[PDB]
Design a binder for this molecule. Structure first.
Ligand SMILES: O=C(O)[C@H]1/C(=C/CO)O[C@@H]2CC(=O)N21
Ligand SMILES: O=C(O)[C@H]1/C(=C/CO)O[C@@H]2CC(=O)N21
Length: 423
């Protein structure tokens, strides 16, 4: 158990030594904060829209220092640096990178505090926020069903954002198995198929040719919305929908029509009249509205904010549905002797994982205004699997925040697995 001084020193050294895209970006961003006084444009994605306000943003950040590194948490294309400022005030620097190491998101925010968890009640009492509906569901998978380790509101259907991509993955695998689509088949990016971040594929030029395998990899590992939309277009909505009952969903009608990310963005934050039409329409009327809406996006990232999940403009499922889709994916992966499914599912575990404990970890996050979820399947080297599903929804995005809180609650549960999961 490293003492505070030990932990900070280790973090400082690790940041200095990290020879990776995240290490490069984190050191550069820390340089911005600690330094005496076009280099910016070269470090960020080409379409970085805050470039004008950025000089002021950095001035304001710098005014909060001086800063000392206390913790460093690189996780693939995501990274967090915990900083202490004067008088014991703490902040977190959050980085999200694109596929070549350019910065997409860079924030410096008040520290997200998550205590070490001893009991499930610690989890519940930490997580609870007035005005936020939450759910925690943890199970051990066994031959003859699931052993419930903890449950709060698992039966409640809730919006889950990009968790829907798990169903899309199962639908894709089902079609690969049938031979109607192939891993090396080429998908082509068109202006109409481009969606918003999360993801990187939207940044590719019109006409870019990508394999089904690479597109599915990004769909899961980067939560790539454009990747997901390319897959959903190739399979077709009917195929995606007809798959839902088999892949584990209890009431497919909640995700009919099964929306694309493009559709959620455009409907959710585009013209209000069209959105009011959705609300008053039945399934037929909604399908008709979506067909009419097909085309190039008008909605931009800056338009998002107001919650729309309460109108059905999201993907609703219960915690049991999440466990079923994950267990289904575990089965699909084992059946795939090529290891293609496994490589996609294990690429990004969402945390730094103890690989001596866990043979495989599947992970998926979901987020939309007023929506946050994280889920993991963890299987040890003996073959015992656990599934953890964390969900939050609210009428106001500010009650949820950037998702580090819920992720960090998951991190603490997994850290305390011997007490909370495998006791
Ligand atoms: O993949 C991740 O870890 C991302 C994510 C993606 C949702 O599409 O949602 C949570 C919030 C965040 O930064 N996480
Ligand atoms: O390891 C942890 O406890 C948490 C954390 C907390 C931020 O101080 O940062 C990383 C991301 C995450 O969930 N981990």
């Amino acid at each position: 158990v490293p003492t505070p001084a030990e932990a900070a020193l280790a973090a400082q050294t690790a940041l200095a030594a990290d020879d990776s895209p995240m290490g490069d970006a984190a050191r550069w961003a820390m340089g911005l904060l600690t330094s005496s006084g076009e280099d910016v444009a070269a470090r960020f994605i080409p379409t970085f829209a805050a470039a004008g306000n950025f000089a002021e943003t950095v001035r304001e950040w710098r005014s909060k220092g001086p800063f000392t590194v206390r913790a460093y948490h690189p996780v693939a294309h995501k990274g967090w640096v915990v900083l202490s400022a004067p008088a014991g005030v703490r902040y977190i620097l959050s980085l999200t990178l694109d596929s070549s190491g350019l910065i997409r998101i860079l924030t410096l925010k008040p520290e997200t505090v998550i205590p070490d968890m001893v009991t499930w009640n610690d989890v519940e009492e930490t997580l609870h926020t007035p005005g936020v509906q939450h759910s925690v569901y943890a199970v051990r998978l066994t031959p003859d069903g699931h052993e419930v380790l903890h449950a709060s509101a698992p039966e409640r259907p809730m919006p889950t954002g990009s968790a829907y991509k798990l169903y899309l993955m199962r639908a894709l695998v089902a079609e690969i198995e049938k031979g109607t689509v192939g891993w090396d088949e080429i998908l082509t990016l068109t202006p109409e198929l481009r969606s918003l971040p999360t993801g990187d594929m939207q940044d590719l030029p019109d006409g870019t040719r990508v394999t089904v395998r690479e597109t599915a990899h990004k769909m899961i590992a980067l939560s790539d919305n454009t990747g997901a939309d390319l897959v959903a277009d190739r399979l077709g909505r009917e195929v995606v929908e007809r798959s839902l009952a088999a892949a584990g969903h209890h009431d497919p009608s909640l995700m009919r029509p099964f929306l694309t990310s493009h559709e959620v963005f455009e409907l959710g934050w585009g013209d209000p009249e069209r959105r009011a039409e959705w609300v008053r329409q039945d399934e037929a009327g909604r399908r008709e509205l979506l067909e009419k809406m097909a085309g190039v996006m008008t909605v931009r990232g800056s338009d998002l904010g107001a919650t729309v999940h309460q109108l059905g403009i999201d993907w609703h499922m219960d915690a049991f549905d999440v466990v079923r889709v994950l267990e289904g994916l575990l089965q699909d992966s084992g059946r795939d002797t090529s290891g293609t499914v496994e490589e996609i599912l294990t690429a990004y575990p969402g945390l730094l994982i103890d690989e001596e404990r866990w043979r495989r970890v599947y992970f998926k996050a979901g987020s939309s205004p007023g929506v946050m979820m994280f889920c993991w399947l963890l299987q040890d080297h003996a073959g015992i699997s656990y599934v953890l599903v964390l969900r939050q929804s609210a009428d106001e995005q500010r009650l949820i925040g950037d998702g580090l809180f819920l992720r960090g609650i998951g991190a603490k549960i997994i850290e305390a697995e011997a007490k909370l999961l495998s006791s």
